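Why predict the complex rather than its parts? Because the way molecules touch one another can change local conformation, and only a joint prediction can capture that. The input here totals 158 residues.
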Amino acid sequence: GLISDPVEVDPIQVGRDEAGWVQELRDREAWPKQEVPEQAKKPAKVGN
Amino acid sequence: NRRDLRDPDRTVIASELVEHSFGVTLDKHVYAALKFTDEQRTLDIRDYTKQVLMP
Amino acid sequence: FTGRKVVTEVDGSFVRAVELQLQASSITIVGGAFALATTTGTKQLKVRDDNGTDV
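Output of the joint prediction:
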């Protein structure tokens, strides 16, 4: 739109989030230890 | 797979090989940002390398 | 082509080999307290004895 306008969401970022391979981890300073996020234990894709 | 010897049937169980994959991505932007007014840049700072860049 | 045999004595006793097993005194479910991801979510449980084996 305009140069001064706020930055639009990146389509690359949207696609990367959709693929769901960004790494999320348990918090270091949470007691008791947090559960494993559902992303960290997903299985490998069946097709290369 | 294994089958009995001299079996009357001769069917053979095919084994298909499967290749898996996973993604590696850049996701963080680690930075350190400093700001100095002209008053701080002129008077307070006496050696830029040893007071700003190294820390 | 493969074939195998276990050599037993003339009376059917097997004495050429000896089997050893670790004693298990107590078992504990891995992970301790846990919660499911959603209402309908499922997860495979695992339990280990005091020897660390997967029973």
